[model samples]
Target: MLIYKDIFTDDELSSDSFPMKLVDDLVYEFKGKHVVRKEGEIVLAGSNPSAEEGAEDDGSDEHVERGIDIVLNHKLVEMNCYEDASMFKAYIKKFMKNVIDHMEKNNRDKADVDAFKKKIQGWVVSLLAKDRFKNLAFFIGERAAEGAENGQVAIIEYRDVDGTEVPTLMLVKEAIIEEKCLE
Candidate 1:
Protein backbone atom coordinates (compact mmCIF):
# COMPACT_ATOMS: atom_id res chain seq x y z
CA MET A 1 0.00 0.00 0.00
CA LEU A 2 3.07 2.25 0.17
CA ILE A 3 4.69 4.08 -2.72
CA TYR A 4 8.31 4.91 -3.57
CA LYS A 5 7.66 8.44 -2.28
CA ASP A 6 7.03 6.99 1.16
CA ILE A 7 10.55 5.52 1.38
CA PHE A 8 12.58 7.97 -0.69
CA THR A 9 12.70 11.73 -1.13
CA ASP A 10 12.49 13.38 -4.54
CA ASP A 11 16.20 14.23 -4.67
CA GLU A 12 17.43 10.83 -3.60
CA LEU A 13 15.11 9.08 -6.02
CA SER A 14 16.08 11.18 -9.03
CA SER A 15 16.93 8.93 -11.99
CA ASP A 16 19.98 10.96 -13.04
CA SER A 17 21.39 11.10 -9.49
CA PHE A 18 23.04 8.17 -7.72
CA PRO A 19 21.96 7.28 -4.20
CA MET A 20 25.23 6.27 -2.52
CA LYS A 21 24.02 6.57 1.05
CA LEU A 22 20.84 4.72 0.26
CA VAL A 23 22.83 1.90 -1.32
CA ASP A 24 25.11 1.63 1.70
CA ASP A 25 22.19 1.47 4.11
CA LEU A 26 20.44 -1.10 1.93
CA VAL A 27 23.57 -3.26 1.79
CA TYR A 28 23.79 -3.46 5.55
CA GLU A 29 20.10 -4.23 6.00
CA PHE A 30 19.69 -7.01 3.43
CA LYS A 31 22.94 -8.70 4.40
CA GLY A 32 21.40 -9.22 7.83
CA LYS A 33 19.36 -12.37 8.64
CA HIS A 34 16.12 -12.63 10.56
CA VAL A 35 16.50 -13.51 14.23
CA VAL A 36 14.01 -13.91 17.09
CA ARG A 37 14.24 -13.72 20.88
CA LYS A 38 14.11 -17.14 22.47
CA GLU A 39 14.73 -17.93 26.14
CA GLY A 40 16.81 -14.77 26.62
CA GLU A 41 18.93 -15.50 23.52
CA ILE A 42 18.56 -14.63 19.88
CA VAL A 43 17.89 -17.33 17.26
CA LEU A 44 16.88 -17.48 13.63
CA ALA A 45 13.11 -17.03 13.28
CA GLY A 46 12.30 -20.13 11.14
CA SER A 47 14.82 -22.38 12.89
CA ASN A 48 13.21 -24.34 15.68
CA PRO A 49 15.74 -26.65 17.31
CA SER A 50 13.24 -28.82 19.18
CA ALA A 51 10.60 -29.01 16.46
CA GLU A 52 10.86 -32.00 14.16
CA GLU A 53 12.76 -31.20 10.99
CA GLY A 54 10.64 -30.77 7.81
CA ALA A 55 7.45 -30.29 9.81
CA GLU A 56 4.77 -28.33 7.95
CA ASP A 57 3.04 -25.41 9.55
CA ASP A 58 -0.72 -25.95 9.90
CA GLY A 59 -1.43 -22.24 10.39
CA SER A 60 0.17 -22.27 13.84
CA ASP A 61 1.78 -18.86 13.61
CA GLU A 62 0.30 -15.91 15.47
CA HIS A 63 -0.16 -12.42 14.09
CA VAL A 64 3.47 -12.09 12.99
CA GLU A 65 5.14 -8.70 12.81
CA ARG A 66 6.81 -7.84 9.49
CA GLY A 67 9.51 -5.65 10.94
CA ILE A 68 12.73 -4.63 9.20
CA ASP A 69 14.60 -7.33 11.08
CA ILE A 70 12.34 -9.99 9.61
CA VAL A 71 11.75 -8.68 6.11
CA LEU A 72 15.12 -7.45 4.80
CA ASN A 73 17.34 -10.50 5.08
CA HIS A 74 18.91 -11.83 1.90
CA LYS A 75 22.39 -13.25 1.37
CA LEU A 76 22.72 -11.57 -2.00
CA VAL A 77 26.02 -10.27 -3.27
CA GLU A 78 26.83 -7.32 -5.50
CA MET A 79 26.78 -7.84 -9.24
CA ASN A 80 30.12 -7.79 -11.01
CA CYS A 81 28.89 -7.79 -14.57
CA TYR A 82 27.19 -4.47 -15.09
CA GLU A 83 26.35 -5.25 -18.69
CA ASP A 84 24.26 -8.31 -17.89
CA ALA A 85 20.76 -6.97 -18.42
CA SER A 86 18.90 -10.22 -17.74
CA MET A 87 20.75 -10.83 -14.50
CA PHE A 88 19.55 -7.53 -13.10
CA LYS A 89 15.92 -8.31 -13.87
CA ALA A 90 16.34 -11.82 -12.52
CA TYR A 91 17.51 -10.49 -9.19
CA ILE A 92 14.52 -8.20 -8.94
CA LYS A 93 12.10 -11.03 -9.69
CA LYS A 94 13.83 -13.33 -7.19
CA PHE A 95 13.65 -10.80 -4.37
CA MET A 96 10.06 -9.93 -5.12
CA LYS A 97 9.16 -13.61 -5.01
CA ASN A 98 10.77 -13.89 -1.59
CA VAL A 99 8.83 -10.93 -0.22
CA ILE A 100 5.53 -12.17 -1.64
CA ASP A 101 6.10 -15.62 -0.19
CA HIS A 102 6.86 -14.16 3.23
CA MET A 103 3.76 -11.97 3.15
CA GLU A 104 1.51 -14.84 2.11
CA LYS A 105 2.92 -17.05 4.86
CA ASN A 106 2.16 -14.33 7.40
CA ASN A 107 -1.41 -13.99 6.03
CA ARG A 108 -1.17 -10.39 4.81
CA ASP A 109 -4.34 -9.13 3.14
CA LYS A 110 -4.43 -9.50 -0.65
CA ALA A 111 -5.35 -5.89 -1.36
CA ASP A 112 -2.33 -4.48 0.50
CA VAL A 113 0.04 -7.14 -0.81
CA ASP A 114 -0.92 -6.58 -4.45
CA ALA A 115 -0.47 -2.83 -4.16
CA PHE A 116 2.91 -3.26 -2.49
CA LYS A 117 4.06 -5.70 -5.19
CA LYS A 118 3.29 -3.32 -8.05
CA LYS A 119 4.92 -0.35 -6.33
CA ILE A 120 8.09 -2.24 -5.37
CA GLN A 121 8.45 -3.74 -8.85
CA GLY A 122 8.54 -0.29 -10.38
CA TRP A 123 10.76 1.10 -7.63
CA VAL A 124 13.35 -1.64 -8.02
CA VAL A 125 13.33 -1.34 -11.79
CA SER A 126 14.42 2.28 -11.47
CA LEU A 127 17.04 1.61 -8.79
CA LEU A 128 18.73 -1.35 -10.47
CA ALA A 129 19.16 0.65 -13.68
CA LYS A 130 22.08 2.37 -11.98
CA ASP A 131 25.44 0.66 -12.53
CA ARG A 132 26.81 1.26 -9.04
CA PHE A 133 23.67 -0.19 -7.40
CA LYS A 134 24.16 -3.69 -8.85
CA ASN A 135 23.56 -5.43 -5.57
CA LEU A 136 20.93 -7.84 -4.27
CA ALA A 137 20.13 -5.70 -1.22
CA PHE A 138 18.80 -2.88 -3.36
CA PHE A 139 16.17 -5.15 -4.89
CA ILE A 140 14.45 -6.46 -1.75
CA GLY A 141 11.91 -5.24 0.85
CA GLU A 142 12.12 -1.64 -0.36
CA ARG A 143 8.66 -0.21 0.24
CA ALA A 144 8.21 -1.67 3.72
CA ALA A 145 11.74 -0.98 5.07
CA GLU A 146 14.26 1.10 3.16
CA GLY A 147 17.19 2.16 5.36
CA ALA A 148 19.42 0.58 7.99
CA GLU A 149 20.94 2.18 11.11
CA ASN A 150 24.18 0.83 12.52
CA GLY A 151 23.52 1.51 16.20
CA GLN A 152 20.47 0.85 18.37
CA VAL A 153 17.15 2.35 17.21
CA ALA A 154 13.87 2.50 19.08
CA ILE A 155 10.59 1.18 17.62
CA ILE A 156 7.44 3.27 17.94
CA GLU A 157 4.54 1.77 19.91
CA TYR A 158 1.65 2.39 17.50
CA ARG A 159 1.66 2.69 13.71
CA ASP A 160 0.41 6.21 13.00
CA VAL A 161 1.72 8.86 10.58
CA ASP A 162 0.47 12.41 10.01
CA GLY A 163 -2.57 11.83 12.24
CA THR A 164 -3.71 8.96 10.00
CA GLU A 165 -4.42 5.53 11.49
CA VAL A 166 -2.91 3.68 8.56
CA PRO A 167 0.09 1.38 8.27
CA THR A 168 3.06 3.65 8.78
CA LEU A 169 6.78 3.47 8.06
CA MET A 170 8.94 6.08 9.80
CA LEU A 171 12.48 7.01 8.88
CA VAL A 172 14.23 7.25 12.24
CA LYS A 173 16.87 9.95 12.20
CA GLU A 174 19.78 10.71 14.66
CA ALA A 175 20.37 7.02 15.43
CA ILE A 176 21.81 6.47 11.94
CA ILE A 177 25.58 5.99 12.13
CA GLU A 178 27.53 8.36 9.86
CA GLU A 179 31.23 7.59 9.49
CA LYS A 180 30.73 4.53 11.66
CA CYS A 181 28.36 3.02 9.06
CA LEU A 182 28.18 -0.70 8.47
CA GLU A 183 31.23 -2.63 7.49
Candidate 2:
Protein backbone atom coordinates (compact mmCIF):
# COMPACT_ATOMS: atom_id res chain seq x y z
CA MET A 1 0.00 0.00 0.00
CA LEU A 2 1.13 3.61 -0.69
CA ILE A 3 0.56 6.60 1.59
CA TYR A 4 1.35 10.33 1.32
CA LYS A 5 1.86 13.33 3.62
CA ASP A 6 3.34 16.86 3.57
CA ILE A 7 6.88 17.28 4.90
CA PHE A 8 7.97 20.77 3.92
CA THR A 9 6.83 24.03 5.46
CA ASP A 10 5.46 22.73 8.73
CA ASP A 11 4.73 26.36 9.51
CA GLU A 12 3.92 29.29 7.24
CA LEU A 13 6.11 29.94 4.19
CA SER A 14 7.82 33.32 4.42
CA SER A 15 9.10 35.30 1.42
CA ASP A 16 11.81 37.37 3.16
CA SER A 17 15.04 35.99 1.63
CA PHE A 18 17.29 36.11 -1.43
CA PRO A 19 16.92 32.36 -2.03
CA MET A 20 13.25 33.15 -2.42
CA LYS A 21 14.03 35.12 -5.57
CA LEU A 22 15.95 32.20 -7.06
CA VAL A 23 13.04 29.96 -6.17
CA ASP A 24 10.72 32.37 -7.96
CA ASP A 25 12.90 32.09 -11.03
CA LEU A 26 12.70 28.29 -10.86
CA VAL A 27 8.91 28.44 -10.63
CA TYR A 28 8.77 30.79 -13.59
CA GLU A 29 11.17 28.67 -15.62
CA PHE A 30 9.23 25.50 -14.96
CA LYS A 31 5.90 27.31 -14.81
CA GLY A 32 4.73 25.13 -11.93
CA LYS A 33 4.20 24.70 -8.17
CA HIS A 34 6.21 22.52 -5.71
CA VAL A 35 5.45 20.30 -2.72
CA VAL A 36 6.98 17.53 -0.52
CA ARG A 37 5.54 14.49 1.26
CA LYS A 38 6.77 11.84 3.73
CA GLU A 39 5.49 8.29 4.25
CA GLY A 40 6.30 5.25 6.43
CA GLU A 41 5.31 1.60 6.13
CA ILE A 42 6.08 -1.85 7.53
CA VAL A 43 7.63 -4.58 5.31
CA LEU A 44 7.37 -8.30 5.93
CA ALA A 45 9.95 -10.92 4.90
CA GLY A 46 11.19 -14.35 5.82
CA SER A 47 13.58 -14.41 8.78
CA ASN A 48 15.45 -17.54 7.76
CA PRO A 49 16.56 -17.91 4.16
CA SER A 50 17.37 -21.60 4.64
CA ALA A 51 13.92 -22.37 6.07
CA GLU A 52 12.18 -20.67 3.20
CA GLU A 53 14.34 -22.50 0.67
CA GLY A 54 13.44 -25.87 2.15
CA ALA A 55 9.74 -25.30 2.97
CA GLU A 56 8.68 -23.05 0.06
CA ASP A 57 8.18 -26.15 -2.10
CA ASP A 58 4.59 -26.12 -0.80
CA GLY A 59 3.46 -22.59 -1.78
CA SER A 60 0.32 -22.97 0.37
CA ASP A 61 1.95 -22.39 3.78
CA GLU A 62 4.43 -19.53 3.42
CA HIS A 63 5.54 -16.99 6.02
CA VAL A 64 7.74 -13.92 5.90
CA GLU A 65 9.48 -11.80 8.52
CA ARG A 66 8.26 -8.30 9.27
CA GLY A 67 10.12 -5.03 8.81
CA ILE A 68 9.39 -1.34 8.18
CA ASP A 69 9.37 0.58 4.90
CA ILE A 70 9.30 4.31 5.48
CA VAL A 71 9.07 6.43 2.34
CA LEU A 72 8.96 10.21 1.88
CA ASN A 73 7.29 11.59 -1.24
CA HIS A 74 7.83 15.15 -2.45
CA LYS A 75 5.24 16.45 -4.92
CA LEU A 76 5.42 19.70 -6.81
CA VAL A 77 2.10 21.45 -7.31
CA GLU A 78 2.28 23.11 -10.71
CA MET A 79 -0.31 25.77 -10.07
CA ASN A 80 0.16 26.58 -6.42
CA CYS A 81 2.23 29.10 -4.43
CA TYR A 82 5.91 29.43 -5.38
CA GLU A 83 7.17 31.22 -2.30
CA ASP A 84 8.94 28.31 -0.60
CA ALA A 85 8.86 25.61 -3.24
CA SER A 86 10.87 27.68 -5.67
CA MET A 87 13.69 28.11 -3.19
CA PHE A 88 14.27 24.37 -3.02
CA LYS A 89 13.94 23.73 -6.73
CA ALA A 90 16.16 26.62 -7.70
CA TYR A 91 19.05 25.28 -5.65
CA ILE A 92 18.89 21.89 -7.34
CA LYS A 93 18.53 23.32 -10.82
CA LYS A 94 21.39 25.74 -10.33
CA PHE A 95 23.68 23.05 -8.99
CA MET A 96 22.75 20.55 -11.65
CA LYS A 97 23.16 23.12 -14.39
CA ASN A 98 26.53 24.08 -13.07
CA VAL A 99 27.64 20.46 -12.99
CA ILE A 100 26.39 19.89 -16.52
CA ASP A 101 28.05 23.01 -17.85
CA HIS A 102 31.28 22.09 -16.17
CA MET A 103 31.21 18.61 -17.62
CA GLU A 104 30.45 19.90 -21.11
CA LYS A 105 33.30 22.38 -20.98
CA ASN A 106 35.74 19.81 -19.61
CA ASN A 107 35.12 17.12 -22.29
CA ARG A 108 33.02 14.93 -19.96
CA ASP A 109 35.93 13.23 -18.17
CA LYS A 110 34.81 11.16 -15.17
CA ALA A 111 37.27 12.69 -12.69
CA ASP A 112 36.59 16.20 -13.91
CA VAL A 113 32.82 15.68 -13.81
CA ASP A 114 33.00 14.30 -10.27
CA ALA A 115 35.21 17.10 -9.04
CA PHE A 116 32.96 19.74 -10.58
CA LYS A 117 29.83 18.09 -9.30
CA LYS A 118 31.24 18.17 -5.78
CA LYS A 119 32.25 21.78 -6.19
CA ILE A 120 28.82 22.74 -7.45
CA GLN A 121 27.11 20.84 -4.67
CA GLY A 122 29.30 22.75 -2.21
CA TRP A 123 28.31 25.98 -3.85
CA VAL A 124 24.66 25.08 -3.35
CA VAL A 125 25.42 24.42 0.30
CA SER A 126 26.93 27.86 0.57
CA LEU A 127 23.76 29.42 -0.80
CA LEU A 128 22.07 28.45 2.43
CA ALA A 129 24.54 30.73 4.27
CA LYS A 130 24.04 33.75 2.03
CA ASP A 131 22.33 36.50 4.07
CA ARG A 132 19.68 37.07 1.43
CA PHE A 133 18.76 33.40 1.15
CA LYS A 134 19.94 32.02 4.47
CA ASN A 135 17.51 29.60 6.09
CA LEU A 136 15.53 29.49 2.85
CA ALA A 137 17.41 26.54 1.36
CA PHE A 138 17.61 22.85 2.17
CA PHE A 139 19.24 19.65 0.93
CA ILE A 140 17.43 17.08 -1.18
CA GLY A 141 15.30 14.68 0.83
CA GLU A 142 17.60 11.73 0.19
CA ARG A 143 20.64 13.69 1.38
CA ALA A 144 18.87 14.01 4.73
CA ALA A 145 19.10 10.25 5.41
CA GLU A 146 22.68 9.97 6.67
CA GLY A 147 22.78 8.66 10.27
CA ALA A 148 19.01 8.17 10.14
CA GLU A 149 17.01 5.16 11.23
CA ASN A 150 16.84 2.14 8.91
CA GLY A 151 14.21 1.73 6.19
CA GLN A 152 13.71 5.43 5.48
CA VAL A 153 13.29 6.61 1.89
CA ALA A 154 12.71 10.16 0.61
CA ILE A 155 11.54 10.96 -2.93
CA ILE A 156 11.38 14.60 -4.14
CA GLU A 157 9.53 15.58 -7.32
CA TYR A 158 9.23 18.85 -9.26
CA ARG A 159 6.29 19.74 -11.49
CA ASP A 160 5.56 22.59 -13.85
CA VAL A 161 2.59 24.97 -13.55
CA ASP A 162 1.05 23.16 -16.52
CA GLY A 163 1.00 19.93 -14.51
CA THR A 164 4.11 18.58 -16.19
CA GLU A 165 6.39 16.54 -13.98
CA VAL A 166 10.07 17.37 -14.03
CA PRO A 167 12.75 15.40 -12.16
CA THR A 168 12.50 13.08 -9.17
CA LEU A 169 15.16 13.05 -6.45
CA MET A 170 15.21 9.95 -4.26
CA LEU A 171 17.08 9.42 -0.96
CA VAL A 172 17.07 6.28 1.15
CA LYS A 173 18.69 5.72 4.52
CA GLU A 174 18.41 2.90 7.03
CA ALA A 175 18.81 3.73 10.79
CA ILE A 176 18.22 6.92 13.00
CA ILE A 177 16.70 9.69 10.86
CA GLU A 178 17.02 13.39 11.73
CA GLU A 179 15.16 16.47 10.46
CA LYS A 180 18.25 18.18 9.00
CA CYS A 181 21.17 15.75 8.97
CA LEU A 182 22.89 17.41 6.02
CA GLU A 183 23.90 20.53 7.95
Leading candidate by TM-score: 1
**What's the CA error at residue 175 for candidate 1, in Å?**
22
The list of candidate 1 runs beyond 4 A from truth reads 1-82, 128-183
Any runs in candidate 2 off by more than 4 Å, and if so which? 1-82, 87-91, 94-98, 101-106, 129-183
Q: After superposition, how far is residue 73 of candidate 1 from its true place, in Å?
A: 21
Task: Compute each candidate's TM-score over C-alphas.
Answer: 0.28, 0.23
- As a TM-score, model 2 comes out at 0.23
lDDT at position 47, candidate 1? 37
lDDT of 1 by residue, 1-183 (tens): 112221113222211111222332222221222333223544445533321111122211111122223222221111123333554355345556666776677877899678756666565565445554333222222321234211111111122245432211122121122322223
lDDT by residue for model 2 (2-117), tens: 22212232122212111111221122111211222223433323332211011112111111121111111221111112343564555355436654674568576878667756
Assess the local accuracy of residue 29 in candidate 1 as a C-alpha lDDT between 0 and 100: 21
**Backbone clash tally (model 2):** 21
Q: Where's the lowest-lDDT run of ten residues in candidate 1?
A: 149-158
- How much lDDT does candidate 1 score? 0.31
